[PDB]
Amino acid sequence: PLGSDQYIVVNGAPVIPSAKVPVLKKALTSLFSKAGKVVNMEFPIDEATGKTKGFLFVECGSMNDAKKIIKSFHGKRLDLKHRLFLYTMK
């Protein structure tokens, strides 16, 4: 019912306003889905500025799904200014 080690932390992700999260979320999900199974993605928001904190959390539904995403996306360039870094959230 409940899984373990399926949560992963992502760093180096675009810091954008809240209204632009839906688009980015769908884009990142489509990307990560290529390598692993994605269940839910969260974009923590900074109350002070109304923008994302730059990092996010990804629930993959299973352990090996989270590890295949980390292995495939860690240290990769999302774009010019952004380079993603992933690791399992203990």
Author numbering: 72 to 161
The authors write:
The largest of these factors, eIF3, is a multi-subunit complex consisting of five stoichiometric subunits in yeast (eIF3a, b, c, g and i). One of its large subunits, eIF3b, serves as a scaffold within eIF3 as it interacts with several other subunits.
Two different truncations of the N-terminal domain of yeast eIF3b were designed based on homology to the published structure of its human ortholog. However, they were not easily reproducible as bunches of needles were obtained instead. Comparison of the relative orientation of the monomers between eIF3b-RRM76–170 and eIF3b-RRM76–161 showed that chain B in eIF3b-RRM76–161 has been displaced by ∼9 Å relative to the same chain in eIF3b-RRM76–170. Therefore this dimer is most probably an artifact of the crystallization and not the functional unit of the protein in the solution. This is in agreement with the gel-filtration profile of the protein showing that it eluted from the column at a volume corresponding to the size of about 10 kDa (data not shown).
